[PDB]
Amino acid sequence: AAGSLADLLSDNRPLLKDTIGYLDVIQAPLVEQKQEVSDILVQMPQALK
Amino acid sequence: QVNSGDAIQRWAANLNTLAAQSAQNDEALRSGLQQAAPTADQLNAVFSDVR
Amino acid sequence: STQVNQLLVNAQTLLAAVNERGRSVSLLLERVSSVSRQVEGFVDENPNLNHV
Amino acid sequence: LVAAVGFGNTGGDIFERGGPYLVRGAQDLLPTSALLDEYSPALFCTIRNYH
Amino acid sequence: ELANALQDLNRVLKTTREFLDRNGGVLTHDIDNLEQVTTAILQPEPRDGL
Description:
With 49 residues, chain A is an all-alpha fold. Helices cover 94% and strands 0% of the residues of chain A.
C-alpha cells in the first residue's frame, strides 16, 4: 500500500495541481453568484411543468 | 552454530548498522512517536465521519 | 532450558514466515520514505487547496 | 498501538465497502473523459454565445 | 535505510496532522453534501427520469 500510494502521487501530482487550479477558477464565479444559482434551481421545476 | 557463522556475522553487522542509524536519529524517533500518538486518532475521526 | 529451546524454534518459524515475503519486506523502508516525501510534496505545492 | 488498531479497522472497513465502487467508476469514466476532452473547443464559445 | 525512513515518517506525520487540522471539517462537509445530493437525484423516479 505504501508503494502504491507513492506511485500514484508521483504520477498524478502535476495533474492534480492543475485540476485544483482549474477547479478554483471554475468555482470562483459560481460562489460569487450563488444566489442566482439557487434562484434558478428553485424556478426551473415549475417552468418545466 | 559453526555451520551458520557467516550468517551470524552478517546479521551482527546488519544489527550494528540498524542500531547506529536508529541511535543517530534518537530525537527524530522521539518526535515521531509523539506526533504518531494523536495523528492516528485524527485519521480515525475523519474516516468515522465519512464512514 | 525448555523455554530457551522453544524461544529459538519459534523465532525461527516467525522469521521464516516474515521473510517469505522478502521482496516487499526489503522495500518497506524505501516505500514508506517515498510515500512520506510524496505526501509532503503534495501538501507543500498546493497551498491554495483549502480555499478551493 | 491502540490508535493504530482503531484507525486500521475503520479505514479497512471504509475501503472494503468503497473500493470496488471507486475502481469500477474510474474504469467506466475513461470513455466519457475522452469524449469530453475531444469536445473541449465547443465549450467556451458555446457558453459565451448562449449567455 | 532507517535514518531517512524515520526522518521522513516524522515529517509526514507532522504534515498529515496539520493538513487534517486545517481541511478535515470542510472535506467531510463536502463529502456529506455530495452524498446527499447524489442520493437525492438517484432515487427511483429521478433515476428513470434521467
